[PDB]
Amino acid sequence: VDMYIERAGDITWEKDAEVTGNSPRLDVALDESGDFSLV
């Protein structure tokens, strides 16, 4: 068994986290292989 896991942290919200990114509205399609594409 090649793959192994190691703990990296608790799952918590951080107040005053760095903020980035925009908020695109995109038409997309999802194929049987789980890949998204643009319409």
Binding site: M3, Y4, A8, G9, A17, G21, L26, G34
Partner: protein
Amino acid sequence: GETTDGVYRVMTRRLLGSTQVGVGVMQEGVFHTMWHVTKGAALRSGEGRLDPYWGDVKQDLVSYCGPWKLDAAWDGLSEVQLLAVPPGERAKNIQTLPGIFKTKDGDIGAVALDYPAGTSGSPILDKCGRVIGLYGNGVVIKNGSYVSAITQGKRE
């Protein structure tokens, strides 16, 4: 093995050195990640082993040791946080307002943040710290940047 709730790296030594191939979430005794990270293979946790339990290529999700447990959903209004766990780097929270993937089968939240491949499976959180889905299945947009669905499973 360690089954404490939290976020974990998914590592391999099959390549040069130790490589991070993705990330996942331990909750209620079940480990949750994206299918493309593990391709459904068994995992090691210390001396112990985690066997796959459920998965689906099209959803791009997999659970180990039990059924999918995560069921919180984006409210469609508020900012969220990606708890990015990049290879070789400390866990970091990044706050953002999701966009939307419109599909023929309905709308999904999306996050416009670009992290290494080995960051796939990192949790996206709401303001109460609940996991609303996992990062790393998405699309390349016109300018060549990346946007990830907020991918969430079903708790049966």
